[PDB]
Amino acid sequence: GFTSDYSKYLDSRRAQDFVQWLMNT
Amino acid sequence: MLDELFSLLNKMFELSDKYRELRKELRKAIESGAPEEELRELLEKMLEIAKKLLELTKELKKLVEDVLKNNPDPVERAKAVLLYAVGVHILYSESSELEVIAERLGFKDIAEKAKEIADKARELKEEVKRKLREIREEVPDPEIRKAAEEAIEMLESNDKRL
Numbered sequence: 001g002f003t004s005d006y007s008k009y010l011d012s013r014r015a016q017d018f019v020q021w022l023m024n025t
Numbered sequence: 026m027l028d029e030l031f032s033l034l035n036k037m038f039e040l041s042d043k044y045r046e047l048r049k050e051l052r053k054a055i056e057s058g059a060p061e062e063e064l065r066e067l068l069e070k071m072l073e074i075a076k077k078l079l080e081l082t083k084e085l086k087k088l089v090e091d092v093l094k095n096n097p098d099p100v101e102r103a104k105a106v107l108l109y110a111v112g113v114h115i116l117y118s119e120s121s122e123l124e125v126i127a128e129r130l131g132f133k134d135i136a137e138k139a140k141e142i143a144d145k146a147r148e149l150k151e152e153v154k155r156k157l158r159e160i161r162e163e164v165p166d167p168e169i170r171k172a173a174e175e176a177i178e179m180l181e182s183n184d185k186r187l
Contacts, residue, residue, distance in 0.1 A: 001186075002122075002125075002126070003186060005045070005048070005049055005052075008045050008048070009045065011118065011182070012038065012041055012042065012045065014179075015038075015111050015114060015115065015179065016038060018111060018172075018175065018176070018179070019031070019034055019038075019108065019111050021172075022027075022104050022107055022108060022172065023027065023031055025168060
């Protein structure tokens, strides 16, 4: 089973939000 | 300092976004019965993204080694490894999936090459996981300890679906 296009987009959004948190903390 | 790590990571994110669009195009090409060479060219571009991601992750790793050797701030050193862990996550996520995609479609050439990147990314994932656990034990900062925990969960999230 392959993960959906949107689930792939969420994983990228979470990683970006994580990186964004690191540089504003 | 960390600014150069962010710059490399933005490149990886734009490469990951292109990878997702190609994955989208690849799905629609299969759904419409596109010719095999049309799928190969889409798979080749994804492979080139996987290789550029690996090159960036190796670059990111060298910059983190410089931060770990020179920066006296333990929280800044931990943030460098946390940023590098995100890069390794991006590399493993796309390379591991590209290998599985190429295998399911029957492209052994592209599956073997993607597999080589995934195997290298896997050893990078294991190495950064060891450093992440050492950060939770060595850095008292609750948010940096919390961040190391999540970055581990992030890295392990790929192998769960696989």
